[PDB]
Symmetry: D3
Subunit: 278 residues, 6 copies
């Protein structure tokens, strides 16, 4: 019916992967790389390209139907939005951190100057612990704030952890947020579900591999525990053996394959896939 309005990051580390997913999903790409909008007349969707912080606000306020942004940003925004899908890129860990030497606990955070780019996120986490501290807002590069003499500890996005160790800092406590890129919606229904199914179909193509193997009937129980599938594993025969098909995660596939080999599975074969409509 009415044209759907979808926002994607214009720039930075969440942009290229997001525009890759949208192109794989069949959506019309931008005519020039300096465009901040594109209209796809075949699929009836208008795309806007914005800074990630603004994406959460305008899904929240209803000016956009969907957005792609970081989970941590959403956690920090306090916008009226629900996470509709996890996108499998841009992943990071949000962590308390402080100077090395002392053994640090969450309890040590009391009465401290804490620097972060995500003040609402942090204020909310401190309230759940019952801790009063003074939270200092930076725009980024927050892990030099303690060498700069503006803070005692930090709360910051961590990827590898190289930046922390290169600056003599140790992460402590459980992560406040485990972040990855997410498709958000405000907290034309068929069209909305259609878009979600397209995007999910691509994500599943990126995250899962198809496994084919022959397994003994003897071992079938253990095998389905090892490979449950995204959908019900196809199972068919052939004297006492069976042939199996199941989507499995790409991350774990060698470990999965070794376990199957360890319970008598044979002719184990992994292959890529492109899209799902499950």
């Amino acid at each position: 019916g009415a044209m759907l309005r979808v926002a994607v990051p214009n720039k930075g580390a969440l942009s290229e992967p997001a525009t890759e997913i949208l192109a794989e999903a069949g959506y019309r790409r931008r005519t020039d790389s300096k465009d901040l909008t594109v209209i796809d007349p075949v699929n009836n969707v208008e795309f806007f390209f914005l800074r990630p912080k603004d994406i959460a606000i305008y899904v929240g306020s209803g000016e956009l139907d969907f957005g792609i942004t970081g989970r941590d940003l959403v956690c920090d925004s306090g916008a009226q939005v629900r996470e509709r899908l996890a996108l499998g890129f841009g992943s990071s860990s949000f962590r308390y951190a402080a100077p090395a030497g002392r053994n640090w606990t969450t309890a040590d955070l009391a009465g401290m100057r804490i620097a972060t780019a995500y003040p609402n996120l942090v204020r909310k986490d401190l309230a759940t612990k019952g801790i009063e501290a003074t939270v200092i807002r930076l725009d980024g590069a927050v892990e030099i704030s303690v060498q700069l003499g503006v803070a005692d500890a930090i709360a910051d996005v961590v990827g590898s952890g190289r930046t922390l160790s290169q600056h003599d800092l140790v992460a402590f406590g459980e992560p406040l947020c485990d972040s990855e890129a997410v498709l958000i919606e405000r907290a034309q229904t068929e069209a909305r579900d259609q878009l979600v199914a397209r995007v999910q179909g691509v994500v599943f193509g990126q995250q899962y591999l198809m496994l084919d193997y022959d397994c003994p009937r003897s071992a079938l129980k253990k095998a389905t525990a090892i490979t449950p599938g995204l959908e019900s594993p196809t199972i068919a025969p052939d004297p006492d053996w069976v042939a199996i098909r199941a989507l499995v995660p790409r991350r774990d596939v060698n470990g999965i394959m070794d376990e199957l080999a360890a319970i008598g599975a044979k002719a184990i074969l992994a292959s890529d896939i492109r899209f799902c409509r499950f």
Copy 2:
């Protein structure tokens, strides 16, 4: 028998894709990138690398057996050649165009200075309309010929259309030619058909994806209308459902997949393929 003689573009936008297709087809690649020839002794084919305009002429005159070049160039050459295969890259649209503001029709072209790099193509198109105009031959960059004051309208290769809008020009009329890279032959037969089948097998691997899904017998009719296949869809069972396999175009696969989902299809799964011999 006798060694086949095949020409490919030496340089420019039709070269790399053509040499990619030939390598995927198993043919011996060039030993140094500054070579204009290579002999493949295993497959009994000699390759020459030439400017695209010359490729059409020498297939025409019999010095080459096959060539790879642009359809628009062939349309313009007037060489004795038949298009044996379409190659799915280098695509473009050949268009009349003129300055914006006026509403333009093909009839407005009468008595006008028309600039183009493809004069024979254009002379032939004007004759079919019954229009007399004066056609001006440029070597390229033809869309500045009207700001230069040498022409009133143009006939030119269009891709995105950015160049036209950046120069205040609007395309009008139906395209004179829809171009893409093509394998040509002059208008040793088993060997010739063998080469065509290799090259086609690669092209099909690039253009189609394999779709697997379960469909209700109820819906089978509509489903085969949605997925006819390059070859007859494989269909087999399983109470009232069936399992299907069909090659479908890569361009349309998300749209195709949504339609199948809309008629009760399930476990729809798209995967790449590399080669066909159909």
Copy 3:
């Protein structure tokens, strides 16, 4: 005496040029590109690498002695800081802009939704005009805010103007700010002046060329009006002619050279320089 504390942008379009100027000025470069600090023990200066918005704040509050950031950011910060030097890169124009078709004036801005990443800058400019409007804060990509339906006009950083024309917007009014990268100070004195003189010496090496020419005594008056120099032009003899030396701006040197040729100057010769201590 005490080690000076200097901040530079960590990332983005103001970073590489700033670190280039500091290396040319003899300062110790970063040991790893993921470092946010470096200490130069020979020159007695500690460098911090931060987000540009934060640079202005911490020079303002005294935690830093000097910073390198954008003039527009400083105009927007309202921090207690004076511009000590202009750095000749990162230049831009800050502009009101609105949809094309209407003829726009500053007076049209009254009662309007204005989107900008620089709200304080804009609030201050509107107060000087006597205009009440509603200023909307975005984080960036502000020129799609009117196609998005969140604003009537914008106030934004403009470089080429391509983004504005690609989105059907026209800049109007005088620029609110003409921006370039600047060395700031809070609004150890010998050491501070030493650092400024180093940095200025590099900037002058980038912006000026040395001109040597022979000029008639006849024409000397007009010539010194054309070439005043950064310092007093060196002038010496040689019957009735003189030989001149003067630093001139790199931007204008061909125009300057033509004017000198037009008043009888000869053997006009421009050459680069690397550093000044003037």
Copy 4:
């Protein structure tokens, strides 16, 4: 049990492919590209990154369990090591070569100055022929040693052969060694076999494609001679035809496909695979 110790080349043409195979095999990648070691605590393996010549020695002497290096290097090392797997990259041919014009035979090598980076390899090959010559050790660039006037012929690594022809040299005799990257072991058993199976599973994914086709029962015999498979070809039905599945080498697949087409095979379809556990 005990952590396995595996060495890979740190740098050069055997490094990136080796680290690609290890990442595809699920092993933990290096945290920084200037690291010479990484410990994978999930899979219980420690990786070291060394110069290729040293890899063979320390597998030989027991300080490493496995190494990845070149076969020619191993042939030259005389270390106590067995080749456990061939890795399908870094391939080369080790060749005698001498100046063009004369017709060269292995017998001509007697009494000659032979330059090579692989003296033990060459001394051993000469002993098997019964030839006494004087072998000269270079560190590399050995094909200029004859223009330099330090040798009469050479024994050297050959890839394309461009370097030889560009220096007026002709390869002669059979290759002393046909080299490619190999996984070596000293000449915790379950863990060792597990690592080999992972690495082999990746290599097979790189070297083979899956072929699906329909074949007449008439032709089945010839077809299985054309496609024997890495594993037993799957064969099932369907009036008089059969459907086949067999892994075939990627290098030969178009030739293989043509032969099958020539014996009445139909719907021949090649597709990639990622991993095997056979």
Copy 5:
């Protein structure tokens, strides 16, 4: 007065150097790289970007005032144009060439199939020798025309000569044309001379270095024979020695410097320059 119209190559090996010279000369650069025109309102010149062959024609016919193109193209065009300036890039040698083995002379060209992209150039050269041959027009890649069996010898652009030797061809005879990029004019005068002087000033900055040295009065005669200068060498004193200044070619400067050292010159010092107005 009237705006000057100047054409530059749009693409290929003569484009970037030409646009570099124009930017160094102070002229307004293109706003987007896909533009075929730019108007410089400060300097009162309009630039067009065209294919090199067309540049010569439209200077010839008066639609352009100046063009930048290759000398060989001009030699081939037969357009009414005079070479106003040589630009010191795009240099090449136009050569007859034929298969190796025979000793070739210009006289051998009689009665032969000669392939070339420059037929008028070649027809004119043959007429001056009194030779009748049949000249065959290709669009390029002409050095495979003899392996293709369409020609006995060629006339073609030669740079390094690698392409010729890689295809078993030897250049013979004197070059028909020694080519480099040139500024052409049709065969508003002050403005035209102004543009030429700007462009020449840049070219001289690229081709010459300033030499400063002390020379004995004894040796002055030999020294001025070694360094005549673009302009009169500046000469001044200082017991029996003199100090010299002279622009010399960049290509020969080490040879020049050695000769001066060989006649007792001292403190010889070469330095770059940027622009001349001589």
Copy 6:
């Protein structure tokens, strides 16, 4: 007279800078990047491109006249060669190093397993200290030899020191060798001195800048102590001031310039130079 024979590294970090110096010195560059030799017929010099270790040997043994290689390699070779020139690139520090925690001295090296790629260098350094240790030869990557359990300390090439700290190692003692690229000769004279003077002229152009300033006669003494020059500073007048010219090192120029400013110098101006013949 006889053609000089000069060797340069074929590959790696000493190659590009060496071939840059030779091209700037006017010598004929390689026709194809896969060539191991080039003959310069104008300057009467033949160039060979070899592995750096072999360069030292063949200068030593007289097969080459000059070579370019690393000082540390020469120190290690024990070839009959004298360092004729230092080339100002490829610089490094050769260092003992061991695991962090203990305070290390040279005396601690006694009875230890020391790993190094430079065993002769190290054996010689230990003999001068009177220390017996066991030196272990690696081909490279030597700083993992202690985590590998093959050595207690190392002697290795150090650049930044990142590799050492990333592997928990501390450098100790004075450097055994301070290395940079060097022009070597065996320990046709005019031609040899000519080549050295060319190469030195380029190196000086890379390492020094020209300084011009006005200095008080008052301060002249201190000023010439600050700027002694590569050659005698030119000094001339002008009431009580003087004007100075002196080549100074590029590395120290801002420090030098500040000191001059501190003793009343004015109009201090640094500029590049290209070549010297001093």
